[PDB]
């Protein structure tokens, strides 16, 4: 298999405008939403048909209960951070946990938090410690690191449980997640040369420009963008020298296949 990942995000907001949830939690496998929960529905629900198909009602009922607890825990934690920052008004609290199963069979795992969209605490599961970006985070680090069992529990979860869940979900969604749609690639002239790719899946793609066999620095890279049909598009551009021609060529790498478009 290519590389795959599983991640769960949480978002808490301290003084949300009317109608907006104070808590949201969404799971992803690769770029695909798989699960959602928020403080308005108070239910964990599938976000992919192959999740709904393969997880029985008892799974959604059990995690609904856990998510209601994690929601309350998130509120208490955000309340503590904002009191220690001495901040008024509405602020945000975020969490991300997950793992990657790499093509070569090795794994990674990560757990981190953010306040107002900036890194706050970052777990290191190898040193079993928390990195704190300021002294509010440092206070939390001290409290969390005093409970060494909970650090060991997160290491087990990232290294063993997370990977097992990812493998399970990869099988459920295999017709979506393990497929390949190669890119359609062309060079447009606009003076700049545009390498344009579309219709590809998965979204990971490498595009660059070479000049006379040396990589151009002077490349403008476009974002990988969703087309809306489950495939993606992207572009990369290079500016032409008006005084001297050059051998330009686009290079595209996607899911193990390399492609070259030489501009005549």
């Amino acid at each position, epitope marked *: 298999m290519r590389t795959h990942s599983l991640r769960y995000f949480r978002l808490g907001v301290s003084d949300p405008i009317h109608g907006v949830p104070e808590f949201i939690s969404v799971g992803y496998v690769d770029s695909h939403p798989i699960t959602t929960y928020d403080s308005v529905t108070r239910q964990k629900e599938p976000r992919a048909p192959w999740m709904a198909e393969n997880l029985a009602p008892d799974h959604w009922e*059990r995690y609904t*209960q856990l998510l*209601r607890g994690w929601q*309350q825990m998130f509120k208490v934690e955000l309340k503590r951070l904002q009191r220690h920052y001495n901040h008024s008004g509405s602020h945000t609290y975020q969490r991300m946990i997950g793992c990657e199963l790499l093509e070569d069979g090795s794994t990674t795992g990560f757990l981190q938090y953010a306040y107002d969209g900036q890194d706050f605490l970052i777990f290191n599961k190898d040193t079993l410690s928390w990195l704190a970006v300021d002294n509010v985070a440092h206070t939390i680090k001290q409290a969390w690191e005093a409970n060494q069992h909970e650090l060991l529990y*997160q290491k087990n979860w990232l290294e063993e*449980e997370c990977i097992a869940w990812l493998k399970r979900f990869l099988e459920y969604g295999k017709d979506t997640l393990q497929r390949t749609e190669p890119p359609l690639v062309r060079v447009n002239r606009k003076t700049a040369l545009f390498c344009k790719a579309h219709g590809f899946y998965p979204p990971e793609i490498y595009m660059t420009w070479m000049k006379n066999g040396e990589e151009i620095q002077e490349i403008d890279y476009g974002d990988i963008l969703p087309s809306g049909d489950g495939t993606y598009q992207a572009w990369a551009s290079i500016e032409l020298d008006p005084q001297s021609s050059n051998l330009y060529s686009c290079h595209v790498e996607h899911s193990g296949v390399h492609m070259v478009l030489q501009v005549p």
Partner: antibody
Amino acid sequence: GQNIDQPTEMTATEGAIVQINCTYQTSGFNGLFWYQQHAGEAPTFLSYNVLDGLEEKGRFSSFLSRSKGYSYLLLKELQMKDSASYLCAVKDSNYQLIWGAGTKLIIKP
Amino acid sequence: NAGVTQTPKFQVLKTGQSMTLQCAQDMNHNSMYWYRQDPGMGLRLIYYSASEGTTDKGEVPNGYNVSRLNKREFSLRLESAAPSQTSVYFCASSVWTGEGSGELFFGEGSRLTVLE
């Protein structure tokens, strides 16, 4: 089906050592607990393991092997007050606690 | 520092009678549980409450129901007592649910005997 197994009863001599085994077959693993329950009383927390290896707490140590699915609770320098039941419990992938039926430990003075 | 406080300690019931067991914890915990303990088997969860304001069935909910009255208190009801409900009932609490290493704190137990 998920299963936790431990012996019904063990008998050892005052002053000696006893190893109480717990083997589990669970859907996922989020930690293993030992509780002590004296006769007629409530279970109280003894130990928690989730990575591999041995952890010491005074006269009691607890060991875990995740790949072999077992734990033991090691009691050294046994005293009459160690007479009790010892309950092991495992958290599965959905964080549900699965409880063993308990091992009653009898100490010979 | 009372910990977990449950009542009654002992109770005799006739088949068909209803009864409520009370449990309070003063540890500012969020999760509460009702277990029954029977000879020869591991503790079985009847109902639990992951946080104030929510509850759900455990492994053996039939014949029982619960109310999480507030953050401190978690009541267990026997709708219509049956001899199979003769058991020792334990209330327990923990700081959270769905964390890893957090242990349970148990009440003293409630011994109930149901007779025809």
